[PDB]
Amino acid sequence: VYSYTEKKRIRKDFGKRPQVLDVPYLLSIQLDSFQKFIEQDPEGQYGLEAAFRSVFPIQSYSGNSELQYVSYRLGEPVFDVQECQIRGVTYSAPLRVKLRLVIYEREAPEGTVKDIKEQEVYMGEIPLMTDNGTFVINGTERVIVSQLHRSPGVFFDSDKGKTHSSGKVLYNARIIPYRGSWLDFEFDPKDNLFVRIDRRRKLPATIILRALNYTTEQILDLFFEKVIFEIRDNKLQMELVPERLRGETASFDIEANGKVYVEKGRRITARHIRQLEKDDVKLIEVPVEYIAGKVVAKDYIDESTGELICAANMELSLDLLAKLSQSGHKRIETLFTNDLDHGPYISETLRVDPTNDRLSALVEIYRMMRPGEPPTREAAESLFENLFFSEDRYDLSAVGRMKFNRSLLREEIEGSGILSKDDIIDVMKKLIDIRNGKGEVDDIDHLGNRRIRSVGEMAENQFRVGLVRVERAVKERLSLGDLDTLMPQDMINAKPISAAVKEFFGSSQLSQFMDQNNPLSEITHKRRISALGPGGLTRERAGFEVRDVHPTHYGRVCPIETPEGPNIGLINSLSVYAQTNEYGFLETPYRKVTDGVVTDEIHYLSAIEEGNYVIAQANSNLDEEGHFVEDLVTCRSKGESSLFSRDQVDYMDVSTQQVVSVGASLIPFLEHDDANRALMGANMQRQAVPTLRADKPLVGTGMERAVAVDSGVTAVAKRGGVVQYVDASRIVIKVNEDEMYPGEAGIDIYNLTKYTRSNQNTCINQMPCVSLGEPVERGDVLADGPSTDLGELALGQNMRVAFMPWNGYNFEDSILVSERVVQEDRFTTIHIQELACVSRDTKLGPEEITADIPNVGEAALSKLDESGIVYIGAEVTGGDILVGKVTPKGETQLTPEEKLLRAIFGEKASDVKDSSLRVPNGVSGTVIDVQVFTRDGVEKDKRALEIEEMQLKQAKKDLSEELQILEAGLFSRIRAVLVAGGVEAEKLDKLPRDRWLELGLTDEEKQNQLEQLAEQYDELKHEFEKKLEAKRRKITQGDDLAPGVLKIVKVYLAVKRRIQPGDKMAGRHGNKGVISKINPIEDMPYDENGTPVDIVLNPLGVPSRMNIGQILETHLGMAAKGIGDKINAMLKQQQEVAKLREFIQRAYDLGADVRQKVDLSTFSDEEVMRLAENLRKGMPIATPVFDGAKEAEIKELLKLGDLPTSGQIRLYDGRTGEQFERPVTVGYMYMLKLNHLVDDKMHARSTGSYSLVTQQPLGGKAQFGGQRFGEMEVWALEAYGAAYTLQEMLTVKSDDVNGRTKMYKNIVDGNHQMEPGMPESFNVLLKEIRSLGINIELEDE
Amino acid sequence: RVLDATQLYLGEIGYSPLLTAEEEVYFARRALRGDVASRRRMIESNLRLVVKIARRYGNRGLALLDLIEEGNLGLIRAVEKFDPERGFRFSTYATWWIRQTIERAIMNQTRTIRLPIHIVKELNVYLRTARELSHKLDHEPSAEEIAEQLDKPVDDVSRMLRLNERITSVDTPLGGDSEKALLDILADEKENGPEDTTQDDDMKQSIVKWLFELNAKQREVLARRFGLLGYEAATLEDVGREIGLTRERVRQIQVEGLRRLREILQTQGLNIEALFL
Amino acid sequence: IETPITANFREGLNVLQYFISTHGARKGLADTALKTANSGYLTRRLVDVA
Amino acid sequence: VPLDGGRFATSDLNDLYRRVINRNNRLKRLLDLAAPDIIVRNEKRMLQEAVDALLDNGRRGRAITGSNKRPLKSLADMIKGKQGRFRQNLLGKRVDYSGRSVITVGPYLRLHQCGLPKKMALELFKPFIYGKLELRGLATTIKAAKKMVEREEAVVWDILDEVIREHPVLLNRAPTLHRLGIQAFEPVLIEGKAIQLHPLVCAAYNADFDGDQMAVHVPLTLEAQLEARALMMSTNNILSPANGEPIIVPS
RNA sequence: AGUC
DNA sequence: TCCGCGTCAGACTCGTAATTATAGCATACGTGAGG
């Protein structure tokens, strides 16, 4: 059971592990997240609903006036994505919000029966996400990368030494909300508990409890266990708890009843403890000396005087005991504090605490945050309540509350966003438990503590900021104004909200130009996770621990895909099967194992859930529809891996691929490649420029098709049916009755995008896959995108490669290529560049776009037409004028020479300059397209007007063909419905189709169908009118441009670049190279058969690199092509469909334990010859990642091709004809041409423009810059002798202004003398030091 | 550890007396008559009002402290032109003055290229109109749309919105990281490259050699006119001051010098070669 | 790491051995980006002194 | 300065000077007006704050944030940092007659040679061409010589070949860790855009041709040419200056 | 966002 | 002992170019051109 597009070309699968779950939609994250932000939910606070209910209702300071939110609505987008990209505008929907101004009476108590004004106000346009997952901001496609941050909740951490060479581990708790001030608790070397509010200055931890209204005795009752001391007759007694002592040393002789249990000065073991507990020991007699040091719990006062004998939390003595006895207290509650397990921390912290009561504590807190400002009681209560106990300034969020409650071992997940008094104490309790030794520290890098924010959360936050800025304005105007004349829209401003959101989608670090070199680049960019940007880490902040692979990354984050750079470890590609949980943690699918039998029941487990279960490995062998074959299965739990029995196994990895990301999944023999090289391989696949002919990969994995489809760059069939009309522009499909809805006409139109510019100026071209009259199913590829073969992803071109040295032409990774590659235009690449020419208005006057340009050859003006615009189709080269432009010059006081010169030619050429847009130097292309944007008031150019004539008539034709094909397809249905219960075949075709409004039949369901088709026909009739008026308006519309700008002409050039020495090429195992030489076909090593090799790569760049994948790819590639060469030979000689069928079935069903079955047979003869015709240019094979082809399977495949098992061949030198002395590994490596072309990197400069302040030449090729002569490079000249070369580089070559011109003149004069001076940078330095008020004179000789 | 200039100043203001109605009247009568202490006490007591106004219009241009000092200048003019004879309170009158001086300062100091209040006021009306347009047109105001609403010239609206264009920092590094500042992209325009300056040297040197190649009387009225050898660039009629003293003979000889020189450029290999230039 | 990689590149690593490899690999790569700075800072201190 | 867009762009020193002048002049005013001393004091604090921001912003506590939120660059910041003027514009600089491109092997080369692309070398030796063109009398003047080069006439190639003869060029690779990271070669004009490097010196540069690039620099003076040929030539720098061993070693 |  | 300040490699490529808000009108102050 295979689909139609798979019947055309089947990939052979060497995988053995049946996939229970298919690869999901890869662009899930971006779409779900943003969809939640815009999604209208009444209850579920997500995006805007949440944002409005959070801020609103806003009530005035006076309390008479209030503004309340009803609902919102997004207007439809003013411009489609297409018009936005061309015009250079943001693709957005207008946000209209219903708001109700309600007013109260001041005279009545809270009478709402005065004024209720309700109206729909504009607050900004919100940028919309494309169906692909991108935003178009100012006509540029951008991706907002999902973010990875610390989940709100609690975290318990500890400086492991660091502070105090004492080497004390200081434990701390950090409470992180989603919004609000941070609450820190920490220990000090002296075991005093401290609180930092908002990481300000230190305060004693007990002070915060006093602010929450805790008496001293209540605090102590919270942290400490009480120990009772009874004073009986004269001897001292204390109420014993059998264990408490436990692992202590007995300081007194412990006697119980009359009989001695402990010996004094011996350690109390488990036996003593169980003896005492079983004897039921509750009183023990003790010496008076033991209480010296014990801490009293409560306040004990003299009932006679009524004065305090001892305050709570005070160290007892023999005399205080005596005074207590004689007052009449024969029971003393003392703190249990035995070091070790129960530490007196809070007891010691109370002694450090300078504050006494609640007020004194609130004042001290107030004084910390606002130091200097006098306390008021109202102010201190207000500040403390507004810190962590205000619903408006503090919000843990659901995830914060949930992680908080789980960390404190609660049962309930959901609760208050504000901190309760119990929360804070529980946190302090856990901190102190961890200090004692029971309980552990949380790990920050653990994915259970790192949460994912995709777009919608971030758009939501910026939108809340906008609202908050508005709330101040609104509340301010509600109080000042008269309430009754004043409506809500005069108070609201749209520009703050629009500005907040604009700054996120345009200025933000996470909003970046989509990387569109190739489909994989796009798909991987959209599933990126960054720990950087706002609310995240910085490169400075980022250590070594965060960057490295965490155990929990298994199945969630790729371990082998991260930029090799400063961003190494902060930026992460998402794993294949990974997804976001409801709270935003990453989760991974796992197959439930029940009673040892491995069900297809699939559970997504979060980082924290995963720790708890034992998960078997994917490679673990299952036994035919039940349990594990092997007794001791290799599994992982508690973040570490070993053998387990079958009964212990809870779960298993869904696929072998789930560990890896998308990009790395496309690497065939990943299993045989070093992880470093593999990283750069997955990284270079993103740099692959699509060639002119998109060639499939012979050695694939199977992710090829998934990636091509999910990327969206391919046109995929929604409805299916049969293709009515193919064209190099469009595909119209007639839908099948079963999916075809009876309402609208059932004809799908996919318009294909032709040769369009990418962000990296690569070429985006869609070609049709299917032929005219082809039956297709839902989810079939209808048209191939730029780097896609029939449905599969095709990033470059496979080639006959031989591993062997050449005459140093492959020295260090250098690549030797055959001329045949260039001839066959393989790795020929298309670049579409967009150049704009802007006509601005200056103080002197408007710039003119005439062809009438001072001092210009007829050669140049030949290519410009009446208006001054180059013709479509015109080939151009550097310096040719594309759009002629002249700028008004003010009265030109000329040098006498120029007066003479302008007098000689008489070409005074009026008061105007030459600012024409001309082709950049050395770039050369054909003009494919021209666009003109004019404003409204200025009279249009003749060429601008003819452009609009074309767009208008072309628009009319497009819409007309829409209505025509839609009407034909709609009446074709009415014709079939009318036949249903009314045979009039020949009679209905004769009368005109235009007079079919009269035609009906009897009142049944079929008459209602006729009514549907008739209402649609007329709907399309008016729709066509309003569509055409829209198009006409946009074509006439003097687009609103930047101020100053009258019009803009955009020229699109198409350049064909040939492969050439200096161009960078790589494979998919991170194996790079620069092309050194293009060898004539004659020279290249050739086979016994006479066939020359395409590429000669250096053997020595494999064993050092430890990417053995490339060699396995080469052996299999040759075997694949071996079988393609057999099929090619059988197709050349026609032969039998029966014989081809035999060979091809034996081939597909080769592998030792091939998962994929192919019962050829069912294929019809026509399907088989179309399949063979595709298999002829080499049978495509799939080697999954970690479940790939075995060496023995590859050698078996080679034998089927009659190729050698060694995959080494005899080669003959093209030059000499003699044989190479030993066999050479030859086969097919799929190779990629990366974006790094020498054409773009080659740069040279003799003299140019110079920098503004420093007077040094500029940097960069775009600015025609000199190479930087850095400190490092200077030192080299210092080590040598070379003093003149150095001075040259410092002086006449850089700053020295006089020196450089003088030496230029000397070099044309052929003097080659320096005449050095003073570097202008130094003159500046002096001036900058004198500006500091330091006298820095230069003493003369 | 109170180090902050703002927190110190606000501490000092709080330490002041708050004035009543009868106290305001007593002090105000003495103040206008020219009491030292009365002026000082009325100013010091009403500093609080300045702050509740300067903190109100925050994050709009200048900083709080800067907005407080300028506001204080309004307080002084307010105390100077207060009328205690009118029953109406001081706070009411002062609020006007403080807002006036703050707004005026914010209109001048804020913009690097200094903008006149007349253009600023016009700008304000354009912007308020844009706001009302934006609320009803889901899109933003066009220049022409604003011009239609105010019944004013499109050119005038465009000139104003151009002046609104606020200034980009040159010293600011752009490339996301501190990679390259704008200064280093932007070249010195007024300064010619050594290539262009050397070309002018060649022309100048050539002219000197070209002057000693034509007729002695053909390069004595051609250069002394254009100001090549002479000191001042004279005209056909003004060459008469030297020795020529002619109008016709000067014009025939000027052009005779240029015609022989046109053939000197056709033979050396320029003429149409150096015409493109 | 207490568990070594028993396999070689010809044999092919399994998912667990490859994942375990990653740690060492990436620490190596991060080392080149970050540590080059301290090496280079030592070169520069040495150069200034002599 | 005016950007092309009609907008202006300015140094942050202008914002800091304007702070200082506004507060200073306001202080003059409040002294003319005999203001109460609390207000005079505030203005004197604010004046010292502005001057301290202008000299060294961020040392006196919280630096004054301008337009983005980034602290304004003050006088001291233009001198101080690595980025100041010392490290950036003075102890190293951008340089004329400098170029770069991808490197590739030249196995055919002798040790003292390097493949230099035609178009790259045309541009680097522009003044040297202009000079010979006028001594041959093929160019009447410099602007005609420039237009002959622009047209890339066949005679110009022959002249360029003549200039490059026995003229050494410096090749540099980042990072320049030791002195052999710069070496001089005699250039060999080659058609195509890639620089060709001799294999045996790849060791000193740590050059591997998987896309590395090199800077080219032209020693202009007779002195600089001689220092390149005698001191910095590939052939003459065979042994490592670090240890006695030959760096020029087959690999 | 990259390249050695 | 704790806070403060100081370093943290060297080049290269691209790409783009924003936001706010200050009322409204009448006399006062300066320069140039025309009568």
Added chain:
DNA sequence: TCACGTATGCTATAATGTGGTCTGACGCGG
């Protein structure tokens, strides 16, 4: 003496203390 951008001036209900980022590190003073 006007023309034209710029500047100063006054409005009188009462109103009178301000309000972004939160985590580097290893060395060496004061």
